[PDB]
Amino acid sequence: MYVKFDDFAKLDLRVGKIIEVKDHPNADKLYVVKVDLGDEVRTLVAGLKKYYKPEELLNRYVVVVANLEPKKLGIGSQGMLLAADDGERVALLMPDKEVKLGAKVR
Amino acid sequence: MYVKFDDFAKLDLRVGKIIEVKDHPNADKLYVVKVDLGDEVRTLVAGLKKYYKPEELLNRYVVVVANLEPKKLGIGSQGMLLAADDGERVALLMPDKEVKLGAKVR
């Protein structure tokens, strides 16, 4: 279903860096990662335990929907990391080069 | 400004592969690329002439807002490739691993 440009612009996609990956004590397959957006530190709950080992996620440049309305998952989460998934594999999005943390995706 | 989850779900972010990069005769800095979404072939107008040489964009796995309402830019365009930009550099988003073309980003 076609989406209008403003419907896209409403989203604030930013580039961030995962600073901490901790296990979410209150959910089996969720990780509680902290993302560094340069001016702020978004801590969000992401389900990547099944596809990523903490060692892999740390220091990774990821893409997050920064302005997603805060939620309580267990623990407080704000935003989500984007990753593609072809029903089989799950692969996080990332810039092809490094950029100022908090870089606007458009 | 907080965005509701459905406001995010409205968008169809897909992984695609750039099959062709041609110069847009009717605009200085625009490229007219064709993206392979696996089941379809989205041809969209992207302004990357300034940051990417055709040789670099070809065979690249990129992320596109598939369901963006078709537009006439000059030439017909549907959707747009996502790239981060810290006001200086411009870096396309891409999966960290390869995935079925047309893979849903979420």
Topology:
2 copies of one chain form a homodimer.
Chain A: H1 5-9, E1 13-23, E2 31-36, E3 41-46, H2 54-57, E4 61-65, E5 71-72, E6 76-77, E7 83-85, E8 90-95, E9 104-105
Short description:
It is classed as ligase. Chain A has one domain (about 1-105): Beta Barrel (OB fold (Dihydrolipoamide Acetyltransferase, E2P)).
Could you describe the 3D structure shown?
- Chains A, B: Is required not only for elongation of protein synthesis but also for the initiation of all mRNA translation through initiator tRNA(fMet) aminoacylation.
- Chains A, B: Homodimer.
- Chains A, B: Residues 7-106 form the tRNA-binding domain.
- Chains A, B: Belongs to the class-I aminoacyl-tRNA synthetase family. MetG type 1 subfamily.
- The structure is a homodimer of 106-residue chains.
- The first copy, chain A, is mostly beta strands and 106 residues long.
- The first copy, chain A, has a single domain, classed as Nucleic acid-binding proteins (OB fold (Dihydrolipoamide Acetyltransferase, E2P), Beta Barrel), CATH 2.40.50.
- Chain A is built from two helices and nine strands.
- In chain A, strands 1, 2, 3, 4 and 9 form a five-stranded antiparallel β-sheet that branches. The first copy, chain A, has a two-stranded antiparallel sheet with strand order 5-6. In chain A, strands 7-8 form a two-stranded antiparallel sheet.
- In chain A, a hairpin with a 7-residue loop joins strand 1 (13-23) and strand 2 (31-36).
- Chain A is globular, with a radius of gyration of 14 Å.
- Chain A binds chain B through residues 1-5, 7-8, 10-15, 60, 63, 65, 67-70, 82-89, 91-100, 103-106, and chain B through 1-5, 7-8, 10-15, 60, 63, 65, 67-70, 82-89, 91-100, 103-106.
